[PDB]
Amino acid sequence: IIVTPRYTIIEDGAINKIEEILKKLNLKNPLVITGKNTKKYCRFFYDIVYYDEILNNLELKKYTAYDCVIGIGGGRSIDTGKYLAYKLGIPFISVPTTASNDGIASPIVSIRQPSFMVDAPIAIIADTEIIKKSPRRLLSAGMGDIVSNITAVLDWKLAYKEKGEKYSESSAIFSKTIAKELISYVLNSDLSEYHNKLVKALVGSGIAIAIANSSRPASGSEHLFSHALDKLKEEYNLNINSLHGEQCGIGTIMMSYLHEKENKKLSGLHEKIKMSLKKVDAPTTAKELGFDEDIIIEALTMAHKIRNRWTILRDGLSREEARKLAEETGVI
Amino acid sequence: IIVTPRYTIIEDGAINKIEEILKKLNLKNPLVITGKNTKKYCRFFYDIVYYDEILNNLELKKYTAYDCVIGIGGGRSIDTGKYLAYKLGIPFISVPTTASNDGIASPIVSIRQPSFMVDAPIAIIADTEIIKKSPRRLLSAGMGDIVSNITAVLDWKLAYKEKGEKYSESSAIFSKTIAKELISYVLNSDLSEYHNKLVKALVGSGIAIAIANSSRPASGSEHLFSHALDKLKEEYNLNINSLHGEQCGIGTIMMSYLHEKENKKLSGLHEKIKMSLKKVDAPTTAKELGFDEDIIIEALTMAHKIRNRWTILRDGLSREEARKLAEETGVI
Ligand SMILES: NC(=O)C1=CN([C@@H]2O[C@H](COP(=O)(O)OP(=O)(O)OC[C@H]3O[C@@H](n4cnc5c(N)ncnc54)[C@H](OP(=O)(O)O)[C@@H]3O)[C@@H](O)[C@H]2O)C=CC1
Ligand SMILES: NC(=O)C1=CN([C@@H]2O[C@H](COP(=O)(O)OP(=O)(O)OC[C@H]3O[C@@H](n4cnc5c(N)ncnc54)[C@H](OP(=O)(O)O)[C@@H]3O)[C@@H](O)[C@H]2O)C=CC1
Ligand SMILES: [K+]
Ligand SMILES: [K+]
Ligand SMILES: [Zn+2]
Ligand SMILES: [Zn+2]
16 A cells, blocks of 8 residues: 655645645645744644654643644654654645755654654645745755665665665656756756755655655665764754764665665766765864764664665675775765 | 545445545445446445446435535546545545546546546555456556556656746656556566556556646556547547557557667657566557557547647657657557
8 A cells, every 4th residue: 555645736825725635635624843943934813833842742631632743843743743743543644834845745753763654745836936945955965865865776776786675666666757857957057946856856756665665765775874873863862963964875875875886877076975965064074074984984884783784885894894984975 | 726536445345445535534425426337346325426427417405415425436536536526515535446547546537538637646556456457458557557658647747848847856756667667567476466566556546646736647648549539530420449548558669669769768669568468468569459550640630639738749740750659669
């Protein structure tokens, strides 16, 4: 069984179409989940809750009256609403106020690792006028999440070839081509439609996940690396507000380089990815990202263990190989 | 808006999931539309109506009570139910009993030309046990409807290039790769999962249409050719039981060859397509299809006029060109 969105809207002023969509879906009493910084975009009568409240106290019969959940804001607002909808057995509507990650339209819940699959949101309502004005850092981070499809798909193919893992060529090429087109737009344009093209790309990626019934087309080694970084932040109680997308971008730079070494046909791939990220002002080094080199290296060595998913990392990098990789790609 | 299916089920015994799916969609009063040969698969107590009977006297408050339409059967049952759902402003559930064309999951209504866009079905319930047993000719025809994505996409790229028509690389490559995968499966395997792979491909193709908001990834000059054939059958009152997919398959052979003349990198594409069609016993010649060579030639010369859609046919083939084309590809 494949669950996809029913409705997808990407346009200026889309936020005003919430009610139209609810009506189309025969829904009447949403619970809105949002953030403190995004509450200003919530202009309607519906009940509103902040994702903090929910998160501190998951478990509930408190939510009995709602026939759906609307997640408005950033990745965490969305992710939290998605999870909540799942727990309540009701549809989820995704209303991103930025373009920072591919959770927007994905069936993936990433509240706490390990992440799991639920239903894709029933609707995606992406107001590009709001998104255009979101903090630049979040838009830049979104690029990180998109370029990662490239290594995710490379890693998927690899897992197919070397471990006979189940693979779909048509899903993979869809996911990959989304990334390719955005890279090529970023490298050849004035960027005046970047926010638009980025949100379309992120939504496309979520659909790819749904259709493949797997995060494989959107998540591979580069994501393992990012999760490792997250683990280490928590562990060492580091105070670094690096974004998910940013970490994935840097991850992709390095993992694309590993794939390049083994396959001369991909010559210049890692450079092109790095360039695309620089062009939109996403970080490409550990220093810009806020991390000491030892954390990057530790994250690399542990990345293959984060999940049971074969990638170009294979059975793992040594500290020495990790250091080399990170040096050669300019991450440190 | 992009409107896509919500639920997609492709598996043995899927027909028994209708109740479950209706419940998930909070739908409770369907009208079932079916055919005389497929009524036997309607094992439920819903109201049932035959498409032919609805088709003659179309235009209605007879149906005010239903909250959805379920189309069960072949292309025409589905196409009729889809149309009806659209007229009533209610969701359509698609329940194919064969795999004969891409109307299964598409937002296209093709009752009579010109065909138009509506909503994608809200659910696709494809029982591969039923479909496996459908008349072999219909399964063979389905291949015709799949390979046509290749020329459709070639024609789309050409319209982008030459007329600046709106184009999506990621949708196009998805649609095209679906066809490639299935061709490759057909040429490499024992065909024991062909029905299953075919249904998945046809559904994928419908999703591609939805996502592109256009029939472009799935319908080009080859489909024009097929419509022209249909026009001529009606006009000369020919009694030829040729299927839509069959006609598209042969169309594809010829249109590929036109693309080949201008782009040598594609050379041999049309022969591979021909081979794939032969491997599943779809017709590849006018004689197998049931037509006289003059009808083929006339259809070719009129195809570009069937709709306002720029293709490799451009402003049209002369009868002499048409004959050469059909001769050079072995169609006549
Ligand atoms: N594999 C993974 O880990 C994935 C995880 N996710 C989920 O996404 C999260 C990351 O999301 P991300 O967006 O990167 O980070 P956050 O959701 O933490 O967002 C960062 C900040 O940006 C703010 N913000 C968002 N939009 C606007 C706007 N228009 N104007 C002003 N501020 C805005 C948010 O405000 P506020 O405080 O109001 O929220 C938040 O404070 C993860 O933690 C996870 O829950 C999603 C995809 C993949
Ligand atoms: N581009 C286009 O123009 C497109 C058009 N269409 C629409 O679809 C139609 C073509 O559909 P297609 O399926 O090729 O042709 P039809 O639906 O006309 O015919 C299929 C025939 O097979 C029978 N049948 C189907 N499944 C079974 C089964 N499991 N067992 C026994 N018999 C079965 C049907 O029965 P029954 O007689 O009971 O119906 C029908 O007689 C077109 O006429 C058009 O309306 C669809 C997609 C694209
Ligand atoms: K991604
Ligand atoms: K097609
Ligand atoms: Zn991600
Ligand atoms: Zn067709």
